[PDB]
């Protein structure tokens, strides 16, 4: 039942720390994370997490957060990743949205 | 009971048409407008309205909209206005938030 309905930004700088506003279907403020991930060719999986507190969850239907730092702040072209909602308790996830990290 | 909790942008170009995401306390999608206004020195009051449809209201707790065109697209410095929620039915309003229009 997790869904990213809309994000006001779907790209960001590799240094992270940028404010994004996200509209979601209902979530519980203490049982929700925003996971950015990238599947590596070596079977590895990079992940980073949106930076926010339960108070940043707006009436269970939106979240304000800051982006995580991407794995490599020295990329020279954009890196495409995904972002999903994930419940902390049972690790249920939303369908992913594409997200582009760009060089500083 | 109307409240603008957060806006992801509190400035915009005088030409209008720019996407803003707004978090609000509960509203009814068919009984809500976003009014930008400016009190003139001559007792006049400019107003413009955010451009959106009821489907742009997200589960009664957020609204995505486009800014209205400011009264004067030829200003040479920023113009400070206010923005409020207003109920269409009984014209109840939220407390206003400052908003800055800037030259193209």
What distance in Å separates residue B21's CA from the closest CA in chain A?
A: 7
What's phi and psi for B54, nearest 5 deg? -50, -30
Count of domains for chain B: 1
Inter-chain touch A25–B62, beta carbons under 8 Å = no
Q: What is the CATH number of the domain that holds B51?
A: 2.60.40.10
The Cα B33–Cα B93 span in angstroms is: 9
Inter-chain touch B62–A58, beta carbons under 8 Å = yes
Task: Count CB-CB contacts under 10 A for residue B13.
Answer: 15
Q: Classify residue A15 as left (phi > 0), alpha (psi -120 to 50) or beta.
A: alpha
Which residues, including other chains, have CB under 8 Å from residue B100's CB and lie 6 or more apart?
Answer: B10, B11, B12, B78, B79, B80, B81
- C-alpha distances (whole Å) from A100 to each of A10, A47, A48 are 6, 14, 14
The Cα B67–Cα B81 span in angstroms is: 12
From which experimental method does this structure derive?
X-ray
DSSP letter for each residue of B17-39: --EEEEEES---TTS-EEEEEEE
The separation between CA A97 and the C-alpha centre of its own chain, rounded to angstroms, equals: 9
B25 touching chain A per CB within 8 A? yes
Per the listing, tokens 């060089």 go with A103
Domain containing A31 equals 1-104
Contact A74, A22 (CB under 8 A): no
């Amino acid at each position: 039942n997790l869904k990213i309905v809309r994000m006001d930004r779907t790209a960001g700088c590799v240094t992270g720390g940028e404010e994004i506003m996200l509209l979601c279907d209902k979530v519980q403020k203490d049982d929700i994370q925003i996971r950015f991930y990238e599947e590596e060719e070596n079977g590895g999986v990079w992940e980073g997490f949106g930076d926010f507190s339960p108070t940043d969850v707006h009436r269970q239907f939106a979240i304000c957060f800051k982006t995580p730092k991407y794995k490599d702040v020295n990329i020279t072209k954009p890196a495409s990743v995904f972002v999903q909602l994930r419940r902390k308790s049972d690790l249920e996830t939303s369908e992913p949205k594409p997200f582009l990290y760009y060089p500083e």
